[PDB]
Write a protein that binds this ligand. Structure first.
Ligand SMILES: OC[C@H]1O[C@@](CO)(O[C@H]2O[C@H](CO)[C@@H](O)[C@H](O)[C@H]2O)[C@@H](O)[C@@H]1O
Length: 628
């Protein structure tokens, strides 16, 4: 294997002697050279574990590094300052000051210029992080909400131009808001040039995807492949018009990229640099679990997948230190955590917590949630969870069967219950969700619907508003970077048109992808409306979180409340949080509280509370007691 010094000398070989001398003394080169020495060993090691003695590895590597230098050289000075800042503050992601939001540019603000006009609102809300959904060119009609990319460089014309995106990102930074976008690296649309040329037989794009002559191998692979959208097609393959079959983990119009080919990594790494230089702060690593395939395995979470992401991580450490990764791994808890590491994905969605928040609202029992916060919350140094209540996707019950077994709970039976409850097919349910991907051959099913629709706000359940505050209070205080599904802060309901839109009717996820509700946002300052109540509540908690140091970091210690309906935890040994998931008053006995100070101030309600006597919480009430 070649070393950093060797490769760097060859990188400089493109310059004339006179030029070279100049570069070798430049500041940019000094920084690039230093990072090369520090991080290249990791990049080489990761790529070697995956590609081994592949003849294309060395050539691809040198091509990628030359590209990395040009990219870093061209990188804007202001971005380089951020590189230096984060390179020296790896825990910026763990700060209590961070609070994020996510929205579709078209649905929330019309277009990019329109989104720029919303920035003042984002500041009003207190956001320091904004994830904008898929912005680039995609097939018209059906594109999986933009996740079927036809071009990584050309902005969706309906949203604006690449120039508009640059301005948006610049304006976000001016507003103290990091920009977060998707890095859809597991697949492209079947209309992407690479796909067309690969399928057409262009030798330059040979093996850029997985294409088979017939069902022989597809049938063998399908013996162990999980179905993500069984509604769209069985197994993981789709048939071409010419009869061949291509790997399509998701929709038929989304073709899985072939990372067993070194040139594919190089291609995507080039796309990462492009995004990096636009000023992106965090890249949402879409479908990280699926980037490596191996006959006989589930083709998820394989070793090479992790190795590749660590390789990608190394490239940013070298050519754009400010760019961090957000892992999207909605899988088994044991698998979810493996993507999180300073050298892999510094942060990642925490589906376990999100899933259990909803579970607890249904069962009124915090057992599973307590278990999770107790044994699966804390993370390695320099990494953090992205805690959320809802997302652009359905809700999957990804808790661990093994964990549930410890508590005497049957995973399969429990999910059947949860599914029925949230789609209003259970007596007394307050939820008004919609089914998503019911798989007849497995019994699995997910749930679609907005936070408000799932808590009963559609029918005006008097407990709806409090349930929302409760769910969000936990994502906001357990430790990690909280993410607000923009629209939830005013109690936005489901979209009542998607079911009849032929481009959406077969994807119930559009039920919880409503447009900006002008009427609800116009009520956010009125305490008599649900929108105002929800808004002022969330805004208050956001304010408290960002200003109070007791919330800093991502570590927590659970507290036994001795009440199966009340969750309890302590942050920094100074903030004691209680959450009542029962629609009835619930009590934490004075006996249970004997070790606590006699009185404590509650940041939620603002009152001083007595802990030397039974503490009775109102239905769905949450308390943030300062115990130190
Ligand atoms: O249920 C309404 C509507 O949802 C769609 C689109 O996602 O399918 C979902 O619901 C069906 C019936 O409950 C499930 O069988 C299916 O698996 C699930 O995705 C539409 O097909 C249906 O009309």
């Amino acid at each position: 294997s070649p070393n950093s010094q060797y490769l760097k000398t060859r990188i400089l070989d493109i310059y004339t002697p006179e030029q070279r001398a100049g570069i070798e003394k430049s500041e940019d080169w000094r920084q690039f050279s230093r990072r090369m020495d520090t991080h290249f060993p990791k990049l080489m090691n990761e790529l070697d574990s995956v590609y081994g003695n592949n003849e294309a590895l060395l050539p691809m590597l040198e091509m990628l590094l030359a590209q990395a230098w040009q990219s870093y050289s061209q990188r804007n000075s202001s971005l380089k300052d951020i590189d230096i800042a984060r390179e020296n503050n790896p825990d910026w992601i763990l700060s209590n000051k961070q609070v994020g939001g996510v929205c579709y540019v078209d649905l929330f603000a019309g277009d990019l210029k329109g989104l720029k006009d919303k920035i003042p609102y984002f500041q009003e809300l207190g956001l320091t992080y904004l994830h904008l959904m898929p912005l680039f060119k995609c097939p018209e009609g059906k594109s999986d909400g933009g996740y079927a990319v036809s071009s990584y460089r050309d902005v969706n014309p309906a949203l604006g131009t690449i120039g508009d995106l640059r301005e948006v990102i610049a304006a976000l930074h001016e507003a103290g808001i990091s920009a977060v976008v998707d890095f859809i690296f597991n697949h492209t649309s079947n209309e992407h040039e690479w796909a067309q040329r690969c399928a057409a037989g262009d030798p330059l794009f040979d093996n850029f995807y997985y294409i088979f002559p017939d069902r022989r191998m597809p049938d063998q692979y399908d013996r162990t492949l999980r179905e993500i959208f069984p509604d769209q097609h069985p197994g993981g393959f789709s048939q071409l018009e010419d009869g061949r079959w291509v790997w399509t983990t998701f929709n038929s119009f989304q073709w899985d990229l072939n990372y067993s080919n070194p040139w594919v990594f190089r291609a995507m790494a080039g796309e990462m640099l492009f995004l990096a230089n636009l000023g992106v702060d965090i890249l949402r690593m879409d479908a990280v679990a699926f980037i490596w395939k191996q006959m006989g395995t589930s083709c998820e979470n394989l070793p090479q997948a992790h190795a590749l992401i660590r390789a990608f991580n190394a490239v940013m450490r070298i050519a754009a230190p400010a760019v961090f990764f957000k892992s999207e791994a909605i899988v088994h808890p044991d698998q979810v955590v493996q993507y999180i590491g300073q050298d892999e994905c510094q942060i990642g969605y925490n589906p376990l917590q999100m899933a259990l928040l909803w579970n607890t609202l249904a069962t009124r029992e915090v057992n599973l949630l307590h278990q999770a916060l107790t044994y699966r919350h804390n993370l390695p140094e320099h990494t953090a969870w992205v805690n959320y209540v809802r997302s652009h996707d359905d809700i999957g019950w990804t808790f661990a069967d093994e964990d549930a077994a410890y508590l005497g709970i049957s995973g399969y039976d429990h999910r059947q219950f949860l599914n029925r409850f949230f789609v209003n097919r259970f007596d007394g349910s307050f939820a008004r969700g919609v089914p998503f991907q019911y798989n007849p051959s497995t019994g699995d099913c997910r749930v679609s619907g907005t936070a408000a629709a799932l808590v009963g706000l559609a029918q005006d359940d008097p407990h709806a508003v409090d349930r929302i505050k409760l769910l969000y209070s936990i994502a906001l205080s357990t430790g990690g970077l909280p993410l607000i599904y923009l629209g939830d802060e005013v109690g936005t309901l489901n979209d009542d048109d998607w079911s009849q839109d032929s481009n959406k009717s077969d994807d119930s996820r559009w039920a919880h992808r409503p447009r900006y509700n002008e009427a609800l946002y116009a009520q956010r300052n009125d305490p008599s409306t649900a929108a105002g109540q929800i808004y002022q509540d969330l805004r208050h908690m956001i304010a408290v979180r960002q200003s109070n140091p007791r919330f800093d970091g991502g570590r927590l210690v659970t507290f036994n409340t001795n009440n199966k309906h009340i969750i309890g935890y302590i942050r920094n040994n100074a903030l004691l949080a209680f959450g009542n998931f029962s629609e009835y008053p619930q009590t934490v006995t004075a006996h249970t509280l004997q070790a606590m100070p006699f009185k404590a101030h509650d940041l939620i309600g603002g009152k001083t509370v007595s802990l030397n006597q039974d503490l009775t919480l109102q239905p769905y009430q949450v308390m943030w007691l300062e115990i130190a």
